[PDB]
């Protein structure tokens, strides 16, 4: 077991660092600049069809907009691109990020979460919209799709088996199931992703013995610090979806 140094995934961009609002282009740009190899972002579909980047509350609300009352599926692209998130930055589309990346030269790769009322839905047009968008930016080999709801991934796989997918576990604090590794293979996932509090040395092994990659996931609620990263290394995970990528990088320095 030649020691694995894990790679950083920027949670919603620069994550919980000061410098920019979550799921905002300035956040993703900043991640490239600081030379961080991956970011995670949250895909949802807005009223007029297009794929937008936004987590929002446990039930897909937009806390800052109006009564704090609306879901993304309620709003046109234009109205969405007229909302303040941070002091000055705005909700991006998926295309805007692609465009961003393309004018750049850093080989950023992405983890796209299908934040999913209706990724589960049998054809809306949603998955083809996604895929065609990806390939219209020759992003096929730099994009990994993930979800807590694995049926959503199957729909991608159905249209294009080449797509790379990571199965996400511990949905509502559910313990990792015994069959988690069988699930992911059967579903033709190349990786698994687990919440930090629910992750064993032995699960990392199970996963590695079947040549699947393992990603530690830090919920937004959780401020990951050096103490946790220490355990991450002990675990020998492949990637860490950190809320403090710059801290994580500064750590891995040593």
Enumerate domains of the chain plus CATH numbers: 1-254 (3.20.20.190)
Distance (Å, rounded) from C-alpha 144 to C-alpha 162? 11
What the block records as the tokens of 102 is: 């393309």
Can you give the resolution of this entry in Å? Answer: 2.8
Q: List the one residue out of 1, 115, 108, 6 whose CA is nearest residue 61.
A: 115
The sign of the dihedral angle between the CA atoms of 184, 190, 196, 201 is: positive
Method: X-ray
Q: CB within 8 A of 181, min separation 6: which ones? A: 192, 206, 207, 210, 212
The answer to whether 157 and 188 are in contact (CB under 8 A) is yes
3-state secondary structure of 172: coil
């Amino acid at each position: 077991s030649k020691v694995i140094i894990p790679k950083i995934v920027g949670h919603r961009g620069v994550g919980k660092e000061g410098l920019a609002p979550e799921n905002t282009l300035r956040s993703f740009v900043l991640c490239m600049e600081r030379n961080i190899p991956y970011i995670e972002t949250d895909l949802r579909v807005c009223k007029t069809g297009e794929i937008v980047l936004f987590h929002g509350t446990p039930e897909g609300t937009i806390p800052f907009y109006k009564d704090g009352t609306s879901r993304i599926g309620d709003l046109s692209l234009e109205e969405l691109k007229r909302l303040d998130v941070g002091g000055g930055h705005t909700i991006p589309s998926l295309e805007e990020l692609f465009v961003a990346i393309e004018e750049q030269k850093f080989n950023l790769k992405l983890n796209l979460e299908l934040k999913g009322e209706e990724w589960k839905r049998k054809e809306s047009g949603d998955h083809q919209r996604l895929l065609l968008l990806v390939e219209k930016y020759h992003m096929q080999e730099r994009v990994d799709y993930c979800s807590f709801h694995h049926e959503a991934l199957a729909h991608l796989k159905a249209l294009c088996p080449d797509v790379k997918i990571t199965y996400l576990f511990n949905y509502m604090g559910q313990p990792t199931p015994l069959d988690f590794v069988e699930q992911a293979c059967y579903g033709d996932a190349n990786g698994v992703s687990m919440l930090f509090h629910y992750l064993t040395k032995e699960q990392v092994c199970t996963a590695h013995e079947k040549g699947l990659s393992v990603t530690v996931w830090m919920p937004w609620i959780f401020d990951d610090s050096e103490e946790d990263w220490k355990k991450c290394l002990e675990l020998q995970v492949d990637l860490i979806c950190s809320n403090y990528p710059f801290g994580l990088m500064n750590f891995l320095s040593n």
